[PDB]
Structure formats: C-alpha cells, structure tokens
A and B are shown apart, each in its own frame.
Chain A
Amino acid sequence: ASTSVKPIFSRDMNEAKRRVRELYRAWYREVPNTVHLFQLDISVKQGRDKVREMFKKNAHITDPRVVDLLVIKGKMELEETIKVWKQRTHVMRFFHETEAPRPKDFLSKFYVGHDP
C-alpha cells in the first residue's frame, strides 16, 4: 500500500513517454516562429539544439509521476512563448550570454577560490 499512489496523468512510464514526445514535437515546430517573433540573434538550429539539451537533462527519470510534472511545466513554459507572455529577455535566459565561462577542472578551481 505504501507504493500505491495516485497518478497525475500517466499510469506507467510507457504512457508518460508518449506525452514527452508530443511535447518535444510542439517545441520543435515553435522555434522558427519564436526566433522570428522575438527577433532573436540566434539561429533556428541553435534554438532547436537548446530544446534538445533541456530534454536531455531529465532523460534518467524513472518515476511516471515526476515525468508528468516535467511535462506540465514544459507545457506551461510553452504557452508563455506561443502567446508572447514572455519577452526577449526571458527567452534568452536559457543561453547565459552574459556569464563568463566557469572552469570545470580541479586546477582552475584551485587558483580562483575555495568552492569544490
């Protein structure tokens, strides 16, 4: 009974993946309209790779309820872009154009500060 829980939308991972793919198609077909309405300086290929990167991060989830939430947030984040509730600043926050690269190796982190 402990592992018996109420679902959000999908009763198993197989149905969850169906929602993930439909969401990906929605984002894939919107980038050309987004890059045009907001007059962005990125290309459509750069836009479509960012969507790919965002989906790739959460590729190790095995909880259908968690996947449902990620899709719910994705659909919310999508409705903001389509209806132009966001602004050019919000869309470009996925890219971090004004943040200097931060080193990933041990030696470089050693020279600058104390964080691991």
Chain B
Amino acid sequence: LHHAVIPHGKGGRSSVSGIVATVFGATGFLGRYVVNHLGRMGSQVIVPHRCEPYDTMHLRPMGDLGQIIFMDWNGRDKDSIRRAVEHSSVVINLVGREWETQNFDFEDVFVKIPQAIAQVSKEAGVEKFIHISHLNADIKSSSKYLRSKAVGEKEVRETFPEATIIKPAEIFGREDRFLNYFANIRWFGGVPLISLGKKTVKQPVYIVDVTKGIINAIKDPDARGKTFAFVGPSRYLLFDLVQYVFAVAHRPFLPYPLPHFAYRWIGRLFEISPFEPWTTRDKVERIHTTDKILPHLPGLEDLGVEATPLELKAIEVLRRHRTYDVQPAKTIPTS
C-alpha cells in the first residue's frame, strides 16, 4: 500500500475517518444505526440498495455532502456486487429476512447471498469483512431460519477466513420486532405462549450496543478471523420478560397456554399474507427458543462496549404503545 486514508480532523461530521465501508442491507433495522455511526465520524459509506430510492431517504441526512453514495444491486448479480466493493476497505453484510418470499427463501438470503459477497470481496481485495450471524445458529434446530444461519456462517468462514462474525441475541430497539412483537398481541385478546412462557430463557441485547460493537470491530486489528457473541447483561424467562413488556406498555395481560402444534397451525394462517406477515411458524420457533451460552467466544466487553440493561431503555421503545414505576422482571443468576 502506498498509504492509508490518513484520518484528519476532530471526529465530527466533516472529518475524515479513513473508513470506506460498503453496507449491504443498510435500509433495514440494524443498518440504520451502522450508517449513522459511520457518518457521524466522517466516513465514506457506499449503500447498495434494492428497494425504491424513496425508501432510502432517511439515510441521506446521516452524512456530509458526498459521504453517502447509493447504488443499485441485485442479490444474484455478481457484477453489481463488485461495483459496490472494489473501492472499499471494509464490507459489512446485514442482508436478512424473517420470512420466505416468493422469490427468496432462507437459503437464498443467508447462504448464497452472503457467500457471493464474501467471494467477490476477496477477489476485489477488500481487507476487513464483517458478517452478522445469529447466536442460536445450529444445523440441528427446529427453525429453518436458524439452520441456514449455521450453513452461511461456515461458507463465509471458508470464503473469507479473516472475517469478523458477529452473533447477537434478539435485538431490541425502537424499530425492533422483538419488544414490538410482544405488544401487538393485544389485538387478539389474550397472550398465547408455549408452556405459559416457562422453559425458555432469552438474553436480549440493545441495538446501540450491537452497533457500537460493529464499529469497534472495524477499528480493532485483533478482530480479524474471530467470532463474537453480543449478548445482553441479564437472562430472563420468556414469561416474565413478556410480563415486563405489558407492564411498561400499561396494557391488560392475559397469558394463557397454547400447545406447540396449535401455535404452528395459527402460524401457517398468517403466512398467507402477501405482505409482511404478522407472524410465521418460523418466527414462533425463535421466539420460544432458549438463547445459548457460549463462554468460549468473546463478547461485547472484549470490544470495549458495556452492555446496556433492558430496564434502562425499555420505556424508550414501548412509550408509543401506551394508551392516552414498573417493577423489573426477575432474572436468572449465573448459578
């Protein structure tokens, strides 16, 4: 290399951070926070988008003039991927979906597409590659969402050995589908749950913590070829966690049990929607899957990020659901 991009300035909006990053799937929940943190320090952000340009408008104020660049890309087109990555020093992959569409299934978005980005990035000479897997990824899981995650997590680890795979738990935030999910069940009278919510333990993490972890992995030389596990600071039961949400939202709480097979039956009914389904059989699996514990993997604390409690920022997300002090839910001590 003749030289790096030589950061200049005070780290503000008009500075130069020396980061030229291509963010795939930047128009979703997680990319709206990564692009903001990249542009808040004066980074060059290339945003390949598949949707209507009107739907990327909220990203324009996140950077100075000429710092956010938009391109068209196609999931199955290798040439389009190459145009977006050949000028970059880091590529971030946030492509994902919680349901299978007519044209894309979990295999297409979690295995083939992540493999194409990784391979083209290697052929184009990108240095840092960051892939977003799941904490509960496992080829022996009842959810096809989580099975494909595992397969993709390996083919990426083979195509780009020096990749920084980030495996977060369920993320919660303003635009999440985790806490906002356990608040729209009120439209159907009662709150169904498998086993009344018992037997399931979750370790949700904050959106900003996951975003601050991603940024620090770009700037840390000791994150190449390494896998992380971004998890929150507390473990809760799926029952009391949902109990806490309805308390903060201040809505009536009627938790009644429903068997596993019945939940799938109502799961298939919603899948008929040609729009974003309210719920799906796959979604029910992950909501009732216990979050794993992998002590051998580095977590947030290894990147300098301090995990944020769900209690400090539950009100921020559920303020909208209130019509017209809540006691924190119980936690599971680590033995």
Q: Which residues of A contact B (CB under 8 A)?
A: 39, 41, 98, 100, 102, 112-113, 115
Contacts and interface: CB of A to CB of B under 8 A. Distances in A.
B87 interface: no
Given A98-B40, A100-B41, A41 B11 contact: no
15 contacts: A39-B319, A41-B313, A41-B315, A41-B316, A98-B40, A100-B11, A100-B40, A100-B41, A102-B11, A112-B7, A112-B11, A113-B8, A113-B9, A113-B10, A115-B10
Interface of B is mostly: loop
Nearest to A41: B316
A32 to B, nearest CB: 12
Interface of B: 7-11, 40-41, 313, 315-316, 319
A100 B9 CA distance: 14
A100 B315 CA distance: 23
A113 B11 CA distance: 10
Contacts of B313: 41
Contacts of A112: 7, 11
B76 to A, nearest CB: 38
A52 B319 CA distance: 28
Contacts of A98: 40
A100 B313 CA distance: 19
Contacts of B8: 113
Contacts of A102: 11
Contacts of B9: 113
Nearest to A98: B40
B314 to A, nearest CB: 10
A115 B145 CA distance: 50
The list of the 3 closest CB pairs from A to B, nearest first, reads A41-B316, A100-B11, A41-B315
B222 to A, nearest CB: 16
Contacts of A115: 10
Nearest to B212: A100
A113 B313 CA distance: 34
A98 B208 CA distance: 12
B296 to A, nearest CB: 30
B261 to A, nearest CB: 42
Contacts of A41: 313, 315-316
Contacts of B40: 98, 100
A17 B7 CA distance: 48
A100 B41 CA distance: 9
A31 to B, nearest CB: 16
Contacts of A113: 8-10
A26 B32 CA distance: 41
Given A98-B40, A102-B11, 13 more contacts: A39-B319, A41-B313, A41-B315, A41-B316, A100-B11, A100-B40, A100-B41, A112-B7, A112-B11, A113-B8, A113-B9, A113-B10, A115-B10
Which of B8, B11, B319 has the most C-beta atoms of chain A within 10 angstroms of its own C-beta? Answer: B11
Contacts of B41: 100
A5 to B, nearest CB: 40
A102 B41 CA distance: 13
Contacts of A100: 11, 40-41
A41 B40 CA distance: 22
Which of A39, A98, A100, A115 has the most C-beta atoms of chain B within 10 angstroms of its own C-beta? Answer: A100
